[PDB]
Structures are given as C-alpha cells and as structure tokens.
Symmetry: D3
Subunit: 237 residues, 6 copies
C-alpha cells in the first residue's frame, strides 16, 4: 500500500481509466465492468477493478488539479505496475466551432502549472500523450460512428482565473478543451516511463456557457468511456 | 448551489474547518460537532455543519493540491458567506528538531506554484495568514497545553518532487512543514476578501521516512482550531 | 511579394516540404517532382513547385533555427495560402535505443527558446504537429517497410550549448532527437491556423555517404506519400 | 570591524533598531537613549548604542533599498552578535482607508526584487517577520494607546515605478505600505539565522499625493519598537 | 573540418565580415577584396578569403536569426582562430529621428531571446561589442564623411511578433534599429573570448535600388576601413 | 526640492559625479573643486557644486545598490536639469589579468536586478553607457598616461551572495569589475533620456582578495576622479 492507495501489487490492471470524480469511477465500474471490486477507498478516492469483454480493467478517480492526479498516477505506475493511464473527463470549449458534447482527444496539453518546468530545467517540455494510445482512441471512436477532435488541451491551475484574458489566447492558438489534469499526467508518464492519454467531453462552451439536455449529455459521456475501453482492446492487438 | 457545492446560502457557518481528506471532515463532524448535518457530497467532497459549544461551525474537505482547494475555498467565500477558513491538514517535516504529530501553524506559506505570480504580476506575493487567527490558535494551544511552532509552511505542487535538493533549501530557510495547499488558500482569501489559517500535524518525516498510516494529535489540531474560533468570537 | 519570398499567390502548392539546407530543395525538385519550376531565389533560398503523382507539391529551404524558419513558414501561410508544412531534416539522438539513420517523427517538440512563451503569455504551450499528418507519415513509412518512431523532439536555440547536462534531461524524458526548428514551426502553425509536421533522420548519436543518401531519399518518399494519404 | 562597519564585537546590543535614514538614527539615539555612544560612521551610516530604561540598545541606519540594508543587517548578525533587527521606517499608502502617520507592522513583505528567488531556487519564499516580535509590537502599541495595522508590506526596488498599474494590484491584495527593504531584511534574517520585524509610518499617500516633509507619529513608531523589545525580554 | 564549414585552420583571416544574406558574401569578395578565393560552400553558405589594401580579410554569410549566426561565429572562433567578427547588415528603425539608409552601430544589443540567460544563469547579461571596434567604425565613417549613430540594437527572435506594443517600448528606451543577430554574436564572442561588432543600415522605418547599393557599399567600406584603424 | 534632495533648479551643474559614499563626495569637492558649496544633506547624502578649471561641476553620493542610486539619478535628471551622470566608484575583480588599481570603464553593465526587466517587458535590455562619454573618458585617461579597460561590469543586488557560483560565470563571460550600481543608473538614463557612465577602480581581486599599499591606492582613485572631470571638458568641446 502507499499513503494514498491501500492496495497491493495485482489489485489494479495494467491499464487504468481515470475520471476526476471518485463517484464517476464507481459509475464506470458499475456500468461497464464485469465482476468489479473496490480496491481502494482512502480519502474516498474510490478505485475498482473488473473486466470489460474479458479484459482486466481498472478505473479510479484522480481528484481535481495537476497536483492531485500527479500523486495517483505516479503511484499506479511505480507501485502497481500500471503501464497505461487513460483520463476520461470533462472540459470547457473556447473555439466557436467546438460544440457541446464534442469528444476531444488531447494529443498535447498546454499548461499554467510550473511542474514541467521544474522537471525540464526551466525550459519548454511538450506534454504529449502516447501516439499509439491516441491512434487506438481515434480508431475506436470511428468504429462507434463518433468523430473525435485531436489537438491541444489546456490544463489550468485556477478554475477561477483572475485574468480572464487567457481564454482569448487559448482560442487564438487553437486550444480544443480546457481542463485541469492532462499536462500533469503527461509529465508523470514521461518522468516515470509509462503511457498516458486524456479524452474529454465538452460540457461547457465558454463563448456561450451552456449545457443542454441531460440525456444526450449522459449519452456522449458514455460513448467517451466506450471509446476508452474499446481503445485498450485495439492496443492489445 | 455552486459548480462544485450543492448547497444554498446559510447551509454553511461563517467559519469552516477544512482538511484535505473528505473522510477526515466526516470524522470531525461526528467526533466534535453536535447535530451534524451533511450539506454536500458533490464529487464526494463531504461537507458538514453543526455546533461546537453552541457555536455554529462547518467542516468540509478541500482535496489535495492548490488547484483543488482554490475551487472550494472560493465558492464558499463568494456564495456561502464564509468569513474564515481554517485548514487542518497534515505535512512532512524537513527539520531535525521536528517530530511526528507535532503541530505547526503557518503564519506564512512558501510555494513552487505559479498561482500567486499569476495574480501578482509575476512578483513575490508573501502568502500569509490572518494575524488574529494565528494569535487565536496560539492562545488556544497554550490553554489546551499543546505545543505548536509558528512559521513558514511550504506548499508543493509535486508530492513526489524530482528536485530532492529543494528539501535542503527548505530546511536551510526553516520550513516547518511540507504540505500542498496553504499558499493557495491564502492567495484565495486575499483575492476574494476573506481570512484564512493553516494548522498542520506532522504526519511524516522526509529525512527519516518514519510516518503515520492519524487521530489524537490530529485530535489536538482540531481542538486548537475549534477553540481558536471561540476566542476569535470574543 | 513578401519580404523574403519574391512570388505571387498560386506559385506555391498548398503543401510545402522544407529542408534546413537550401541546396536540398533543388535535389528534391529534380529527383522527386515532375515539371518543376523555380518560384523563389531571394537570399538564395530556392523554392520549387512541381507535381508528385499528379499532386501539386512545393519545396524550399527554411534555414537553421527557429527564427529563420518562423519567417518562411509564416509568410507561406498568410500570403501564399499554404495549408501544410512538412519539415524534412536531420537530428541528433540522446537515447541508446535510437540509432543512426533512424526515422523520427515529432508529434511534439520541446525547446529552450522563448518564442512560444512570448505567444502564450509566459505559460507552457505544447508545440505539437497535426495528428493526421503524423498518422499519414507513420502509415506511409510502414508501406515503405520502414519503422518510424513517433515522439518528442527538442528544438535547440544553441547547437553548441554551454549546459552539458541538458542532454541527460532530454534522455530522461524520452526525447527522440535534437534539432532546431520543430517547436518554431509548430508555434507558427498554431498562431496562423495551419498544419505542420517535422520528420527527421538520425545523422548523429550524441555512416557512408551512400547510406546517407539512401536514408534521405527514404524520408522524402515518406513525406510525399504521407501527403497523398492525407488527401484521402 | 566589517567591510562597512568599523566597530568590534560588543559595541552593538543584541537588538538593533534600524531606520533607512542615518540622521533619524542619530535623532533616536539623542531623543530616546541614555549615554548614547556613536559606534560607526563608515560611509556616513551612523550607528549608536545606549540604554532604554536600563536596557542596552542600538540604532543604526541601513540606507535605502534591499541591496543596502542586506549588507548592514548581515554584518551585524554575523560579526556583532545581533539577535533581533527592528526596522523603523516610512512608507507610501495605496489603500484609501490608510492615512498619513498611520503605523503599520509588516508580518509579511511582498517584493519585486529577485534576491529571495536567488535564495529559494526561483520559487516563492514568503518573506515574513518573527511572530513573537510582531506580537510584542502589537501589545506595545496597545499599551501606548497607539493604533497599528498588521499585514503585508511591499518592498520595491524602484521608488519611481514605470508600472503604475502595479499599485492597483498592490491595493487589490491589501498592501498596507510601500517601502524598500522589509523583504530583504526578512530574507537575510532567515539566511543568516536571526529575527527581524519591520514597523513603518505612512509618510505619503500614493493616490492623494499628500505627504510629509516627520517626528511625533515617527516618535510613536519608536516607542512601540523600544517597548516591544522589553516585552520580548520578559 | 567543422560541422558547418568545410575548411581548415588558415583558410580564414583573423577578421571576418558577415552579412545575413549569403549572396552578399560573393558580392563583397569580388567588389572589395583582392585575390579572393573560395573557402566554404556547405549549405550554400559561401565563404571567401582575400585581401584589402594588403590586410587579410574573410567574408561569409551567417543566415537569419541568433541560432544560425551563433553556429558560424562559434566555429570560426574556436576552430579557425578568428579574433574579430563584423556583422554588416540591415535593420528597421522605430525612432522618428532615425532615417532610412542611416548607418547604425550597435555598441549594445537587447533581445527577447533566451540564449544569454541560459549562459548567464538566468540573469541579465549586457550583450556588448568591443569598444575599440565600435570606435574604429565611427572614425572610419567620419573619414568617409558619413555620420553614424552609436547605441542599442534590439535582436528579435520573431520578425513577425504577435506583441505589437514592444515597438513602443523599444522606442521609449532609444533602440536605434531592429534586427536579429547582434545579441547572439555578442554572447558568442563573450563565451569564447573574441571580439564582435554589428553595423547596420536602416532599410525600413517602422528608396531606389541605386540608393540601396550606394549605402550598402558605404557600410562595407566603413567596416573594412575600421579594421585597418584597429590594426594601428 | 524633492523628498530626497533639498535643493532647487540651478543648485546642481548639468553634470554630476557620483561616488557611493557621501563622505567621498565631500572629499572630491574639497580636493578638486573651486568654491564648492553644499547643496544637499537630507539623509546625509551630501551633495556639492563648484568649478573645475572654470567649469561648473557637481558631485553627490548615491548610496549602495541599484534601488538607492536609481532614486537620486532619477531626481537629478527630471527635477534638476542634469544631462550627464558619471559614477565614480570601486569594484572587485574576477579576471586573473585584471589587477588591483586597474581603472575599469563600464561600456555595459550586467545585472542581478529585475528592474530593467520590469522596464523592458521582461526581455533583455542591454544596460549601456553613453558612447561619447566612454570615448571622452578613454581619451582623458590616455592624456593622463593611464590605460583604462573598457568592457562589462556586473551590478549585484547581493554583496554577500548565497550561491558563490556566480563569480565563475562572471569570469567566464569576461566581466571586468563587480559593483552594485551601473546597471541601475544606465536603466534610469535610458528611461528618462539622459547620459551616464560608470568608472571604477579595482579595490579588490576576488581571486586573491587583497588591497595593497594605501598611498598608491589613493593615487589611482584620484586619477579616476581626474579622468572623470577631464572627460567632461573634452565633451564640452
Ligand atoms: C471553463 S469550463 C472548465 N474549466 C476547467 N476545468 C474544467 C472545466 N470544465 C470541466 N473541467 C474539468 O473538471 C474539473 C473542474 O470542475 C477539473 O477536473 C477539470 O479537468
Ligand atoms: C513529503 S511528506 C508530504 N509532502 C506533501 N504533502 C504532504 C506530505 N505529508 C502530508 N501532506 C499533505 O497531505 C496531502 C498529501 O498526502 C496534501 O493535502 C498535503 O498537504
Ligand atoms: C547535437 S546534434 C544536432 N543538434 C541540433 N540540430 C541538429 C543536430 N543534428 C542535426 N541538426 C539539424 O540540422 C541543423 C543544424 O546543423 C538544424 O537545421 C537542425 O535542425
Ligand atoms: C511611493 S511612496 C514610497 N515609495 C517607496 N519607498 C518609500 C515611500 N515612502 C517612504 N518610503 C521608504 O523610504 C525610502 C524612500 O524614500 C525607502 O527607504 C523606502 O522604504
Ligand atoms: C521590423 S524590420 C526588421 N526586423 C528584423 N530584422 C530585420 C529587419 N529589417 C532588416 N532585418 C535583418 O534582416 C534579416 C531579416 O529580414 C535578419 O538578418 C535581420 O538582422
Ligand atoms: C566582491 S568586491 C565588491 N563587490 C560588490 N560591490 C563592490 C565590491 N567592491 C567595491 N564595490 C562597490 O562598493 C559598494 C559595496 O561595498 C557598492 O557601492 C559597490 O558598487
């Protein structure tokens, strides 16, 4: 066990899906995994392990922010033999053409944080996902009849920013989705030699700040989970 | 209700104790508050409101890291009329004269986060607590016969730091405890106009590696916090 | 028409291959393109436009360094309607498993330059390529029976850096190759809404001339065939 | 003798009050100390030692700016056994509720200087005062019936700032006074292992432009400082 | 011999004039030097060594940008024994009193690049020229009845900057001209203990071709005559 | 008058020599100026005005550090019509070949301070002296049979540096002298449109940390003052 995870080697699959909300990990295990069992509960960060079409899969929340998810992903990789981390969350949109419910894939992730500069001798480290994982996700989505956008995400330290001028900048440079973990998870994956990918569903459009129907929203979120789970199967081949 | 808190104005007291662990807040509500009522569970971030010796008080977790607690402390202050925030967490020690379960009070908080530089034109903003609250905590500790050092805390973005050498620099400058949110709460208190204080319990020693896997001294911290608000009311 | 390219709209294809060495532009034009014609000569940066299996293609050097290539890529995009930029160059490897003559594809590009911070309010902008272009290059490579590594490049401002330990850091974080333009082209593409990709061959690990020419022609075929896959 | 102080161990008391103006130190030595003896005049930086109600005390100017006071506070601490440094200076106000001659106590000090980043690996070091000294000053003020706000000061490198907008940011974050050395003295106290406190008198208002061209409230500041050491001795 | 210059010790004079445009090196060699011979052609960066009034002089382009010129100036200094580097180029002016075709001499060079911070532990390194070289250029100019302004240049990494207000700042602090290499060459000279100087002619204010050629030849004569004054 | 200078327009010459030590300004006025009168004393920063061979000259201390001298030089220029500022101080040497008593002229000045970054939008402002003033000083020195070195100075914020590694860096990049004001005075001169020059006498060699005889040291310091005063006369022509 670690100070944040009360499990032992073997308790997690070598692939872990990670939502920000611990209650969403439980929701994913309940909805898509067969014979899922809770393998962690410290600080209430629920983790589960079960099978998806016979494949051993794990899903655990990572909390909000780079500092939070950096702790969990780091421990999964070094102490639980986890090779892949697939973040499945929500994000806000700044581009007029990026619509509510669009599925975004973060090939790269820009950031507000100083963590990668601390890692990269104060220079610019391009926080990127694992290419194969990106490709598997794109292909899985195509098979589901879904067209995911692949580009940059922006991982913020302040959900409530003081200088609202950053949104124009994000939009100017083509940022697809705004969230809070991608850049940190990619930094961890690179530092400890593992593979990661962040997929998000647009739950808010900053240009119009909205949400829309709930049934349709829940549908897209599930497609996103489906895309994540199906993508690991393509990777297995 | 706010984006991360499903409650209404009035559900929270004007003072809120906040541990990083939502399960610790539940424990505090059950062990120290009377008529405790759960007022939030969004994302599992348990929040409670009750009374301590007739004083209405709340306790809610804020999660790990500056980005997490910034969201919660902000919504409480702008939408629930919270005047005082008292973080009650754990920390790692770097100084040799600091032992497990020791109580530290961060009158100040250093950090490797950029949040305050983003707020202060890229200059040095000294993330400090409210002086009265510090004084209150010190007096409360004194009256309870519990020891407590007052000084600088270090709020880290990375629990697993790739720069181990920075611990020597922290030690060289007298850092009492290494935690992950004080500097962010102080920055929020300042930006949104409220007051805050961070009290921590040494739960691990970065040099010796001896660590906990809680309570008691964690109960002391709570007593000091709860008793300090009462002094503040008078 | 532009300060560094004496040509007019239409002279360049919407896709432009760009080597660092200007002399390589003519080699590519004569060796891989049909009906090539000269479209630029300013400062000796020769540009050519021709066709590859019917597809309109242009080729012109960009010079060494982020500042140089940022000028050309920018002008091509805003004044000649270029949609995609494919940089085809060389790099140095810091990883033991990455060998001489290997073909590296930069999905991302780190850098010690300050250009992107100037663009992104002093924050971290992840300089990245277009995903489809990356995927096209990979598939075009496999079709040619060539195994290409996809990952991060490091775009250096100083070829002769005084900081020797930075190479160990690059190795620790999996940098595939060290060159000097990727991060700059990716920033320009982002700033002006175009697509870019950097392909490099390992020409030094931190070979015969015939071996070098073979690998160079392989990189060009890959880039050219990737463009065709992109059109589908 | 040190590079900038021609004195020997023992010439200074373990506590030293320090204004930026050498002529103010002379005034303090002549108005509040008995048997005042000049112990330094190198570069005109007048230093004096005497007694206040039987308590041995020194007062020496430190000049304007972080670079100047860093030299003096350092030599005093490493070569003359000075344990406590109490800066008694002037400052400019940005807040509307702050008037001339008001007394401010910097429990913390923000800055646009790089000195602390050079010491703290380019991270945010919270330049704070010694809690006991702050508390001492507060009690002393209380007993003397003098008002005093406790909080953050802003130590500027450029008195004539080209970034006027930074004053709005200072005001937004509750800066009590704009001065030029607190953050540097706190950094030195920390690096060389001593204690320090900065007390200031509002001598100018950056918004209204009304300003002084001293004493009295400048006499209050001195009383608070001298009386605070006595409380500290007990 | 070096990665970017196929020459050997002795091929280059201890003094090298360097224009940004590579094509200008041959013009200078044929127009101002006696008995010129070719000493480099790698990447099309032609270098020549000849003599001016008996004094041994070399000329070769450096490309656009700090990264490009940093490579050439460095190699020339550490492998070909070059003692002085005189960059002769063009720049844009932000000051109203500085006119088109004016000759500007950069005693100092500001920059938005990060190379010198990387060299100077993230602090402020004042990138400056050799004082004697500056004084020589001034005196050589006066002898030619030419009035040259001495001051600060600004070495930009991005010719097309997204920050429009930086030009007002440059004007406020007296920047004489905007170009892209001075600060990089000055850093290299400092790092490897050599001497450097940047001379520029105002080719744009933020003219006929005959006017341009006249002023260009004036800058070259100035540089060449300054070298002779330096030998005294 | 200003909050730091109790004088009125006319009290200072349009040229001001400035030593760090206020007691040294008095020494300079006494030693080289005819009919010098004290024109300032607030905070004890003595200022004087007199004539050198018939030319109206002023000399006033500027205190230690960039923040200190930035206040004085700024007020001299904007409120007292001063056109030129000639700093005359001492510095430490890091280069083995730069010897005790050498006269150094700061054509440029490197710095530890953040003041010029605050002025120059966070970029690199090359803090330089006025060319003509440098030339006049070099020529005046030649006339005195003195050979001054012209190059970069380093203006430090911390006389007592924590990371002693900066001296190797300074030496590596050819820094001639180490002091504490040049970069700040040049920044002020550029911001308010005036002319400045810093000249220093090496009073310490960091590689050997020494001083030597006192008579000879005092001789070189005076030559430096002579060079400064004589240089303004050449400038007048
Ligand atoms: C401006 S809209 C927005 N902004 C920032 N984060 C968002 C946003 N929308 C969804 N997320 C992500 O969810 C958490 C913060 O609520 C975080 O876990 C984060 O990833
Ligand atoms: C090196 S020991 C250490 N390091 C960092 N944070 C620690 C530490 N010990 C306790 N905490 C605090 O608790 C959470 C991280 O477990 C965070 O909420 C944090 O405040
Ligand atoms: C340390 S080995 C190395 N380092 C940097 N750049 C290299 C390197 N090898 C090839 N290139 C690329 O070629 C040019 C610099 O020669 C540039 O165009 C650059 O892309
Ligand atoms: C904008 S008003 C202002 N600004 C900056 N410093 C001030 C100010 N007022 C008083 N001081 C302090 O006194 C000296 C500068 O005069 C310095 O010692 C400084 O601490
Ligand atoms: C805003 S006008 C301008 N800006 C930047 N560089 C200029 C400029 N004018 C001439 N140069 C110099 O020529 C090359 C860039 O064209 C580079 O070699 C450069 O030195
Ligand atoms: C390491 S030797 C050294 N270091 C720094 N400053 C020196 C030095 N020597 C002379 N000065 C200058 O004198 C004052 C500091 O004593 C300051 O005014 C400064 O200009």
């Amino acid at each position: 066990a670690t100070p944040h995870i009360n499990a032992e080697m073997g308790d997690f699959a070598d692939v872990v899906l990670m939502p920000g909300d611990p209650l969403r990990a439980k929701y994913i295990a309940e909805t898509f995994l067969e014979d899922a069992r809770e393998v962690n509960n410290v600080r209430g960060m629920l983790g589960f392990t079960g099978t998806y079409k016979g494949r051993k899969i794990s899903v655990m929340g990572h909390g909000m922010g780079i500092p939070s998810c950096s702790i969990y992903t780091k421990e999964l990789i070094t102490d639980f033999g986890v090779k892949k981390i697939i973040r499945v969350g929500s994000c806000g949109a700044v581009l007029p053409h990026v619509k509510l419910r669009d599925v975004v894939i973060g090939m790269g992730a820009c950031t507000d944080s100083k963590v990668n500069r601390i890692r990269f001798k104060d220079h610019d480290f391009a926080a990127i996902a694992d290419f194969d994982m990106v490709r598997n996700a794109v292909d899985a989505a195509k098979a589901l009849g879904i067209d995911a956008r692949v580009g940059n995400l922006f991982s913020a330290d302040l959900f409530y920013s003081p200088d609202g001028e950053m949104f124009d900048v994000m939009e100017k440079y083509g940022i697809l989705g705004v969230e809070m973990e991608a850049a940190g998870i990619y930094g961890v994956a690179a530092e400890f030699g593992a593979k990661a990918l962040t997929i998000c569903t647009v739950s808010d459009h900053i240009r119009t700040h909205e949400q829309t129907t709930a049934a349709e929203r829940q549908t897209t979120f599930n497609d996103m989970i489906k895309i994540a789970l199906e993508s690991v199967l393509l990777g297995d081949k």
